[PDB]
Design brief:
This is part of a larger assembly, with one chain. The protein has a single domain (1-140), classed as 50s Ribosomal Protein L5, Chain: A, CATH 3.30.1440. The chain is built from three helices and five strands. The chain has helices at 23-29, 64-73, 125-133; strands at 8-16, 36-39, 54-61, 90-92, 95-101. A five-stranded antiparallel beta sheet has the order 2-3-1-5-4. Bound molecules: magnesium ion (3 copies) and strontium ion. It binds one RNA strand of 75 nucleotides through β1, β3, β4 and β5. The PDB classes it as ribosome.
Length: 140
RNA sequence: GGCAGUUUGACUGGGGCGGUACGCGCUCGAAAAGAUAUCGAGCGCGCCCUAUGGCUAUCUCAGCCGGGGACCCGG
């Protein structure tokens, strides 16, 4: 039964939402791969009189690049619980977001015959804390 | 304008003044095919755009919720 049910880390997105940068240089060092900039939709009084323009950057880490990061990133954070999404997700922090999910996820990310993951296969807050906690650190 | 010839439109609950229903577009009036009037009700057009056109690739939007009214992740 299990195995095809045990949690997995599908992507860790690290980003800095400045609102202006060379911050890409450091985000790339702490992660290992090339960052990408983020534009800002809608204009605002806080001098964002530009819609399509650099406001921040991010990096999406998957597989080893993600673990090699969390091993040296999680120690930096502290909190837990009441900091976890309903989808068994959690973000702390420069921000660090961890996306967790069960094995049959591709079914909702592929092009052909897509389908939205059943709420029964959907990860849970508790199932999340467990997995993480059960991997080099403590909860709440 | 000393003098000559003329013009100075139409619509309109008479005419004048006001206005334009004088060329166009939409809803309603309009009575479940089409057509349909009033100085009928609501309101527009006389442009603007070299991309705000065209095709292809990739992608999904308003709004709300949860996690770190800018940005990031998920629903
Ligand atoms: Mg005369
Ligand atoms: Mg004569
Ligand atoms: Mg008719
Ligand atoms: Sr006369």
């Amino acid at each position: 039964f299990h195995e095809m049910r045990e949690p997995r880390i599908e992507k860790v997105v690290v980003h800095m939402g400045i609102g202006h940068a060379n911050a890409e240089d450091i985000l790339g060092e702490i992660t290992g791969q090339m960052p990408v900039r983020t534009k800002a939709k809608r204009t605002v009084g806080e001098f964002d009189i530009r819609e399509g323009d650099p406001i921040g950057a991010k990096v999406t880490l998957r597989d080893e690049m993600a673990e090699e990061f969390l091993q040296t990133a999680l120690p930096l954070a502290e909190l837990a619980t009441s900091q976890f999404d309903d989808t068994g997700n959690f973000s702390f922090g420069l921000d660090v977001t961890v996306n967790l999910v069960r094995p049959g996820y591709r079914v909702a990310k592929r092009d052909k015959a897509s389908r939205s993951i059943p709420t029964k296969h959907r990860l849970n807050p508790a199932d999340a804390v467990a997995f993480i906690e059960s991997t080099y650190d403590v909860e709440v």
